[PDB]
Nucleic acid binder design. Structure first.
Ligand SMILES: [Mg+2]
Ligand SMILES: [Zn+2]
Lengths: 49, 123, 148, 396, 237, 192, 114
RNA sequence: UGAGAAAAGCCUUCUCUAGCGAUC
RNA sequence: AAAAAAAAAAAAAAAAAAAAAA
């Protein structure tokens, strides 16, 4: 895992603006639906074959 | 005769055309008017175009031949708009008409003959 | 998939039938003394124009003088003489290639091996000799065909 | 097999001689290299004569004769000179071959090996005649292709609508371009005499008066009298001197004043060109589309052509779409632009626009397909709308 | 709906050379505009960032219908000389002129005087189009104007299409060149079936020392049409 | 003519001198073009592809070409005026960085006094504001050229050394900006 | 070696020298959105994608206005955006449909997960 | 698959086209 | 197929990344 990072070495995280998260949330939600859609179509092809 | 009205039908072929127009109106297959004839050319749903050579300015209908040469659509002229008026079942003179594509229509055999006759006029 | 076929039904095959004749079909027609054009008309009740390829015509010529009568019947002005530019003489491959391309011909043959290949191509009839009469296999508008 | 071939080209006529060829097997894979490969072609064919065309008009004359199949005098001069007088001459056209044999005693053949030789000559033509003519072979064909095509169709160069398309776009740019400069001029001279922007309501008018008075310090007596002539009314000019005497603007430097003077002058010279462009557009519209210009005006008529992209495209459109071309700028809705006698009520504003669109479509067709353009039809259509406008306004 | 004006969209090259794909919510076939800012028949054009592409309508064009149908080769590539028979008003000719670019040439043949006046107006704006107002049945009458070409495109729509192409191919088409012919089944023979017509035309082509290679139908856009692609006098391999 | 001649001012003068192709042969263009170029220009005259132009068309072209040379002549006069004012207001800057680049710097800052309040590193990157804020948000390397890229000294130096010259030029430049803004004497001694 | 590198920077002469644009998080966001266009609208179906990866040569632009298409096909200037992603963010029809599907997938997954 | 696999620089052996050459 | 590790997102999901079985 190697989770630990020392206090001196660690860097502050990125702080996203509200507009960026709205765009970023749109893609992941879109990708989840699209990935789900393809996987369902995979089983229909295999059953018919 | 004005030379721009080149496909001018004779007496015998005129009788066949105006009969076919009267048949087409009954079967709901005819579009009447210069503007309505133009619209069918854009949609590609015309077999042929019948125009009246007795319009006092002949130029108002000369845009229809330009569209016909691109769609490869036969077209002819007749000597009377008033004779063209009655055969269309309309109470006014008409200078241009268009007969429409109809799938399964029983007019296909008669239409197929009249197209071949028009092409013979162009030799 | 060709537009002429409605599933296994060939619509654009028309009352003028173009028939590709195999080299063996000519020989058995003479043996049974069946006229080539006249017997086809009796089977289909329609105008028929047999087609002779260059590949088929060569196989007749290689047979020798013993089959001279079949060669003279092959050159008939009513027939349709269609060329082919194929490196060789073998004709079974020539006909199936013409069948695959256009789907407008009726195959006339008596060889069993060629018939089983054509059956795999959808929408093409096969004409063969049964008893002393012509017979058609995969055609809906057979009409005057031998009834058995 | 020694025979002569006559090859006709846009640049001129060529005469070539054939020494030897394998005639029977010419159309075969191995032998076809005889004509294809340049070196082998040079072995069997030579150029014995070449008579190029002097001018483009001469080239057009020969092109007409060759198409008709007659023997032009230019062709006959070449043939008579370098051909000995038992002669076989190859031609690509059977009709020109018969005409030559009637005019002169040479035997003409039109097919066989000669057909393959002519393709070899055509494929290798630029190499044989390279440098013999000033104008290139490739440009010779391109130039002749147009002049031959214009002759057949009776093309008229006056009735072309390229210039009106450019002029409308250029008018749009100039109106913005003058406007940007005019505002900057008013700001710079505002530092010296801010009252002037209030008196003058026109950007262009401000520019000449900026030229006319260098400083407010010297504006009096005769120069005041000159000022009343340029200003539309005498009352304002007397107030200008009063404004000049009592003003809070700042004195400007020497080099600063020379800069603003030359700049303000340039806006004027730009403005006078814009007026000349509008004059040039008006003359073009009468020659191109007089009937449409009479109906709705040169300014609106030219802009309608610009939206369509060409005069022919305007005629091909139906009556319904021509209304849409003026939708964004309200060309048919906004009536005083086009000015017509009488006014249209708000209730019938849509109907007048729809009726006006049909008249413009008809007028556009007359301009495009008339043998000679004439503006009588446009004036007749203008009267009919006015009768309709009076019909709605008065009720009869 | 469709491709509304003012939508962000992507242009990527097609498999064929000189042809482009307009990737967006819907996809359209586009070619690079030789004269930016002008539409010859009112198509929708796309601005790319000094560069502009014009949409290609497959219903009003027979070449574009073949491309969308999946034809293997068209042989129209940049820097090629193309002889066009039956140019008509120039809807397809303009797109062909865009593909060949400044280097290539298009020879437009149109007998009719009415449509001929449109080519000259179109040829004014495009320097690589050579208008030829002449009958295509007599190639000897315009042999002055035309040099050797690489591709012959035929859209004449006549009962004698094969003979017209055969005469022009012998006179002007170079060895190893290619030809594309559009066949309207109703034009050659209305009595015979559409499928038997396509077999007859191919037969005549082989009798004229032309080797046809491929054919396909244009069914989603046209009914009873076919496009045949072949080579003339092939080189030995 | 468009391909053979690239100088736009020379091109517009030639059209003003000679209207049509027919007048090209007779007229002489030695004062405008070199004789060798003139021979090629006259050579292209007889072998031409263009259509003949009407009398009204050629007049419009001349009027448009008239406006071109008058705007260009004014622009040169405006440029000379700029050099006059720049040498009068901030002479030390003009000697060092140049008339154009110094003028852009005040235009960006909006005034000479506002530019004076800035530090040396800010002057270096005044032009390159888009690369700076992109780098600071994404934690990339900051830009180094700015508007100074078009200065005379930065242009001549090698691309490897254009990073060093940028800060050396900028650091000394602000010494000229402060002195001109606050000094009561106009002289170029310190700038040189 | 160096002449190969120069030729791969452009599409070539066959397509009039298109150049490969530099890859950014905004362009990459656009390409991912277009690859997943199948699930945007339940009533519209699309063919398979031509290539699994992103295209190497491409250009981005907007469709020019046409005067004849004032009412038939034209988006008003307020609804226009700069990127394909921002267009998806704006329209209500897509957001309403996508939110409903995505909520369902999480809820069905929650039944499986528990 | 098993002179293991992966990457950089130098020689050797050869393959394709495209002009060019055949005009005395 | 599967046990992991590194990121983001939503109130867990998603892209890459290794090993092991087959
Ligand atoms: Mg056999
Ligand atoms: Zn064969």
């Amino acid at each position: 895992k190697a989770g630990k990072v020392p206090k001196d070495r660690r860097r502050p995280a990125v702080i996203r603006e509200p507009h960026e998260r709205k765009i970023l949330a749109l893609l992941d939600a879109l990708s989840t639906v699209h990935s789900q859609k393809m996987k369902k179509a995979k089983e229909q092809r295999h059953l018919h074959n | 005769v004005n030379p721009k009205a080149y496909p001018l039908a004779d007496a015998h072929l005129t009788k066949k055309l105006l009969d076919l127009v009267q048949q087409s109106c009954n079967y709901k297959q005819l579009r009447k008017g210069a503007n309505e004839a133009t619209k069918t050319l854009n949609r590609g749903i015309s077999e042929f175009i019948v125009m009246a050579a007795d319009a006092e300015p002949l130029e108002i209908i000369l845009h229809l031949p330009l569209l016909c040469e691109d769609k490869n659509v036969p077209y002819v002229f007749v000597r009377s708009k008033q004779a063209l008026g009655r055969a269309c079942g309309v109470s006014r003179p008409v200078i241009a008409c268009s007969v429409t594509i109809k799938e399964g229509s029983q007019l296909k055999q008669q239409i197929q003959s009249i197209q071949q006759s028009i092409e013979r006029l162009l030799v | 998939h060709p537009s002429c076929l409605f599933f296994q039904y060939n619509t654009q095959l028309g009352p003028p039938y173009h028939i590709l004749v195999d080299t063996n079909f000519i020989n058995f027609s003479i043996k049974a003394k069946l006229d080539l054009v006249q017997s086809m008309m009796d089977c289909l009740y329609a105008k028929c124009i047999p087609c002779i390829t260059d590949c088929v015509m060569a196989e007749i010529e290689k047979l020798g003088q013993k089959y001279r009568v079949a060669l003279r019947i092959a050159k008939d002005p009513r027939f349709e003489r269609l060329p082919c530019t194929h490196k060789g003489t073998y004709a079974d491959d020539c006909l199936v290639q013409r069948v695959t391309q256009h789907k407008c011909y009726i195959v006339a043959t008596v060889d069993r091996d060629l018939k089983r290949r054509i059956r795999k191509i959808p929408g093409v009839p096969i004409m063969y000799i049964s008893n002393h009469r012509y017979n058609i296999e995969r055609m809906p508008d057979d009409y005057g065909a031998p009834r058995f | 097999v020694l025979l002569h071939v006559l090859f006709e080209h846009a640049v001129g006529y060529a005469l070539l001689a054939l020494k030897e060829v394998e005639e029977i097997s010419l159309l075969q894979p191995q032998v076809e290299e005889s004509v294809l490969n340049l070196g082998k072609f040079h072995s069997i064919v030579r150029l014995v004569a070449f008579c190029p065309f002097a001018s483009s008009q001469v080239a057009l004359e020969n092109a007409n004769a060759v198409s008709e199949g007659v023997v032009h005098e230019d062709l006959r001069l070449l043939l008579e000179t370098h051909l000995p007088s038992k002669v076989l001459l190859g031609v690509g056209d059977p009709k020109i071959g018969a005409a030559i044999q009637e005019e002169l005693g040479y035997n003409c053949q039109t097919g066989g090996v000669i057909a393959e030789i002519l393709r070899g000559v055509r494929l290798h033509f630029h190499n044989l005649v390279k440098g013999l003519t000033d104008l290139s072979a490739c440009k010779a064909q391109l130039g002749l292709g147009h002049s031959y095509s214009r002759a057949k169709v009776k093309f008229n160069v006056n009735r072309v609508d390229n210039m009106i398309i450019q002029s409308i776009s250029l008018l749009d740019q100039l109106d913005k371009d003058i406007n940007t400069f005019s505002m900057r001029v008013r700001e710079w001279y505002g530092y010296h005499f801010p009252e002037l922007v209030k008196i003058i309501n026109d950007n262009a008018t401000y520019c000449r008066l900026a030229q006319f008075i260098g400083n407010r310090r010297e504006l009096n007596e005769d120069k005041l009298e000159k000022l009343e002539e340029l200003t539309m009314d005498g009352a304002k000019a007397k107030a200008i001197l009063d404004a000049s005497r009592s003003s809070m603007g700042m004195d400007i430097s020497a080099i600063d004043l020379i800069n603003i003077e030359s700049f303000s002058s340039r806006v004027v010279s730009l403005s006078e060109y814009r007026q000349s462009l509008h004059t040039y557009l008006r003359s073009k519209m009468s020659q191109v589309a007089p009937s449409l210009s009479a109906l709705i005006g040169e300014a609106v008529g030219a802009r309608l052509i610009a939206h369509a992209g060409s005069l022919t495209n305007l005629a091909k459109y139906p009556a319904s779409t021509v209304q849409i071309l003026g939708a964004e700028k309200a060309l048919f809705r906004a009536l005083k632009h086009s000015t017509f006698i009488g006014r249209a009520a708000a209730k019938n504003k849509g109907r007048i626009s729809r009726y006006l669109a049909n008249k413009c479509s008809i007028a556009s067709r007359i301009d495009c397909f008339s043998e000679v353009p004439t503006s009588v039809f446009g004036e007749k259509l203008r009267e009919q709308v006015e009768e309709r406008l009076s019909f709605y306004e008065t009720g009869e | 709906r469709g491709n509304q004006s003012g939508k962000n969209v992507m242009v990527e090259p097609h498999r064929h050379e000189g042809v482009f794909i307009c990737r967006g919510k819907e996809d359209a076939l586009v070619t690079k505009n030789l004269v930016p800012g002008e539409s010859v028949y009112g198509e929708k054009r796309v601005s790319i960032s000094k560069i502009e592409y014009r949409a290609w309508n497959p219903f009003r064009s027979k070449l574009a219908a073949a491309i969308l149908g999946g034809v293997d080769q068209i042989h129209i590539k940049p820097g090629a000389k193309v002889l066009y028979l039956g140019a008509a008003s120039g809807t397809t000719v303009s797109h062909v002129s865009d593909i060949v670019g400044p280097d290539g040439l298009v020879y437009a043949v149109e007998f009719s005087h009415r449509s001929g006046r449109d080519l000259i107006n179109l040829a004014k704006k495009r320097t690589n189009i050579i208008p030829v107002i002449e009958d295509a049945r007599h190639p000897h009458k315009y042999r002055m104007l035309i040099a050797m070409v690489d591709v012959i495109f035929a859209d004449v729509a006549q009962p004698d299409q094969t003979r017209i192409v055969a005469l022009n191919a012998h006179t002007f088409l170079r060895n190893g060149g290619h030809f594309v012919i559009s066949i309207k089944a109703n034009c050659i023979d209305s009595t015979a079936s559409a499928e038997a017509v396509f077999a007859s035309e191919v037969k005549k082509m082989q009798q004229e020392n032309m080797k046809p290679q491929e054919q396909l139908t244009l069914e989603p856009y046209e009914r009873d049409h076919a496009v045949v692609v072949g080579v003339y006098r092939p080189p030995p391999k | 003519l468009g391909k053979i001649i690239s100088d736009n001012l020379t091109y517009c003068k030639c059209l003003q001198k000679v209207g049509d192709r027919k007048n090209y042969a007779s007229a002489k263009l030695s004062e405008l073009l070199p004789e060798e170029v003139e021979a090629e220009v006259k050579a292209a005259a007889e072998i031409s592809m263009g259509t003949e132009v009407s009398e009204e068309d050629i007049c419009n072209i001349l009027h448009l070409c008239t406006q071109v040379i008058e705007i260009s002549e004014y622009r040169t006069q405006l440029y000379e005026y700029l050099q006059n004012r720049m040498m009068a207001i901030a002479p030390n800057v003009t000697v060092m960085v140049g008339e154009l680049v110094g003028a852009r710097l005040i235009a960006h800052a909006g005034s000479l006094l506002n530019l004076a309040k800035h530090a040396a590193s800010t002057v270096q990157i005044l032009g390159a504001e888009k690369a700076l804020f992109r780098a600071l948000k994404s934690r990339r390397d900051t830009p180094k050229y700015g508007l100074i890229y078009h200065a005379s000294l930065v242009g001549q130096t090698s691309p490897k050394h254009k990073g060093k010259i940028s800060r050396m030029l900028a650091a000394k430049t602000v010494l000229a900006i402060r002195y001109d803004a606050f000094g009561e004497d106009s002289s170029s001694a310190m700038g040189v | 070696k160096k002449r190969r590198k120069e030729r791969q920077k452009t599409a070539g002469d066959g397509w009039f020298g298109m150049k490969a644009p530099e890859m950014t998080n905004e362009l990459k966001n656009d390409l991912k959105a277009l690859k997943m266009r199948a699930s945007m609208d339940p009533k519209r179906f699309y063919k398979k994608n031509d290539r699994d990866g992103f295209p190497k040569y491409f250009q981005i632009g907007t469709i020019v206005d046409n005067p004849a298409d004032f009412y038939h096909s034209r988006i008003p200037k307020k609804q226009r955006k700069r990127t394909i992603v921002e267009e998806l963010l704006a329209d209500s029809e897509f957001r309403r449909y996508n939110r409903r599907k995505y909520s369902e997938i999480m809820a069905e997954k929650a039944a499986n997960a528990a």
